[PDB]
Structures are given as C-alpha cells and as structure tokens.
C-alpha cells in the first residue's frame, strides 16, 4: 500500500600552486588530529 | 579631468632562465589572477532603490537612441539639434540632462520618434583615434636595450622624468622638454 | 608570528558575535603580517566578497590584511593593487 498509491507528500579557487599542497597537509593535520518486509498486504478500511 | 589611462601590465618575472623561481612567480601571478576572477565571479552572484528611477529613465529614453550634433540652445528646455542626415531639428531638452555639458558642438544623445534630447555623448572619440591609444603595454623594458644610455636619459628626462619628479623642473624654473 | 595564532583564535570564539568574527578576522591577519599566504589572503577575500559597522569591520580588516599579506613582495603588491581596484569599483 505504501510502495504503490498516494504519490508525494562559491567555488575555492584550484590555486594548484599552493592550495593542493595546502590541502594535503591539513589532511595530514587531521591525521595527527584524529523495506523486505514492506507492508505488500496493505491493509485498508471500508 | 579624465585622468590617465594608462595601459594595463602584468609584473615582471626576474629569473627569466627556467628555474623554480620563476615557476614560483608565475605561480603566485596566477594564483592573484585566479584570486580577482573568484572575487569578481562571486560579487555578482553572490549579491542578491535606484532601480525605479534608472527604469523610469530608460522607459522615458526608449530605443534606439540616435546620436546627433547639438546646433543651438534657444531655452532652457529647448534646443535645436541637426540629426546625422544634416536636418535641423528643434527638439526638447528633458529633465535629466545636466545642462551644463550641454554646449554647440557636442554629440547629444535623442530620441528616436520625438528627436527629443535625452543624453549627451561624452566620448563620442573618433573610432580611427581610440584604436591608437595603447592598452596592452609592450613588454620590450630598457634593460632590453643594449647602450643607448645618453638617448635613455634623454627620453627620461623628456617624457619620463617630468611625471615622477617634477619638482626638479619648478624649482629650476624650466619647463620640461615637451 | 604566524604559527601560534590557531589557539588564539580557539580562545577568540568565546567572545559572541558580530565583534567575535571582527577580532577573529583582525588576529588572523596580523598573524600573517607580511608572510605572503596565498590561502590566508583567499579567505580574506572571500570574507570581503559576502555582504552583510562591526559587520563592515570585518571586511575592512579583511581588505587592511590583503594589504598587509601582499606588502611581502612586489609581485603580489603589484597583483593586489588591480585586486583593490576590482573591489572598490565593484
């Protein structure tokens, strides 16, 4: 009853350079930081 | 005033020889360069009044907006502006428009239909002038002139050193060589 | 004196907003005073790009550091110029 009926209810820039190496070493810093059962007989009134 | 327009150069890289330096530099330019297209990428976007009065006005200008000669002032209000083809028109002179920069002679901005004077053109520069103004500077500096050291100094004190230093020329009393 | 600021700024948070993220901004930069971080001016600029006083002097010291950042070298004195430019006419 339930699977079938009533339907519904900045971007960091590269800076390859610098900013690749950056990230991989904040990653390092963080490093040393750190339904089957579905109810197919839908039950229903009058 | 409409003060320099000075051409637009990047900084200069010193190693030149392919060193990482050099890779550094060129790194660190293009890292500024990647810096001001964020900026200037996100100002607009990430930006969310004069609007009614810059729609009234644009309503009221229409287009297109012809570009004529202004002959005459009669009024204050009033004015006689001859269209491109040559015809006299004695059109009317809106609000806003300083009057001031309205003088005979210059290219004033009208209307398509009522030829009424809605703008005056400032730059109105000849197209065959404005391509020779230079943008892009030449990357050709006087460390890339071998001698020529007595017409180096020459120029400088010609075309160069009046702008950087021209107290040396008012106090001497001279005028620099123009 | 770059490399000992983080727990400044850890300290700094206790302080309630908006004069927190002013003191935060202004730290950080003159943590870096004249290092040359590339980073550390891109979160600056990044600071004065969003719009909202205190909330103005964030981005005030934000574009006081881009300077301050950028004094380093002449390249990035050179590159920050044009980036000042860009700013104040947009």
Request: aromatic share 6%.
């Given at each position: 009853?339930?699977?079938?009926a ?14 690749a190496?950056?990230?991989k ?13 579905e ?6 009134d009058? | ?13 010193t ?6 330096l ?27 009044k ?6 009234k ?14 002959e ?38 009208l ?5 009424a ?12 002038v404005?391509?020779?103004?230079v943008?892009?500077?030449?990357q050709?500096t ?12 020459e120029?400088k ?6 702008l ?7 106090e ?7 | ?5 983080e727990?400044?700024?850890a300290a ?8 927190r993220?002013f003191?935060?901004t ?25 719009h ?18 950028a ?5 990035g ?14």
């Amino acid at each position: 009853p339930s699977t079938f009926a009533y339907p519904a209810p900045k971007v960091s820039t590269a800076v390859l350079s610098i900013t690749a190496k950056a990230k991989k070493k904040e990653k390092e810093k963080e490093k040393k930081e750190e339904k089957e059962p579905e109810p197919n007989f839908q039950l229903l009134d009058n | 005033t409409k003060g320099p327009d000075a051409a637009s150069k990047l900084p200069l890289v010193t190693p030149h020889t392919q060193c990482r330096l050099k890779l550094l530099k060129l790194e660190r330019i293009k890292d500024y360069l990647l810096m001001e297209e964020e900026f200037i990428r996100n100002q607009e976007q990430m930006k969310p009044k004069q609007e009614e009065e810059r729609s009234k006005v644009d309503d009221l200008r229409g287009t297109p907006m012809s570009v004529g000669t202004l002959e005459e002032i009669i009024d204050d209000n009033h004015a006689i502006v001859s269209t491109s083809v040559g015809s006299e028109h004695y059109v009317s002179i809106l609000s806003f428009v300083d009057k001031d920069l309205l003088e005979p002679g210059c290219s004033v901005l009208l209307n398509h239909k009522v030829h009424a004077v809605i703008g005056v053109l400032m730059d109105d520069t000849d197209p065959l002038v404005t391509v020779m103004k230079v943008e892009k500077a030449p990357q050709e500096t006087y460390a890339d002139i071998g001698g020529l050291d007595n017409q180096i100094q020459e120029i400088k004190e010609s075309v160069e050193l009046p702008l950087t230093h021209p107290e040396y020329y008012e106090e001497m009393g001279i005028k620099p060589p123009k | 004196k770059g490399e000992a600021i983080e727990a400044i700024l850890a300290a700094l948070e206790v302080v309630s907003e908006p004069f927190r993220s002013f003191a935060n901004t202004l730290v950080d930069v003159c943590a870096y005073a004249g290092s040359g971080n590339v980073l550390k001016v891109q979160q600056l600029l990044h600071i004065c790009s969003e719009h909202f006083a205190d909330m103005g002097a964030h981005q005030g010291v934000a574009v006081l550091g881009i300077a301050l950042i950028a004094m380093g070298e002449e390249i990035g004195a050179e590159m920050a110029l044009r980036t000042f430019g860009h700013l104040l006419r947009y």
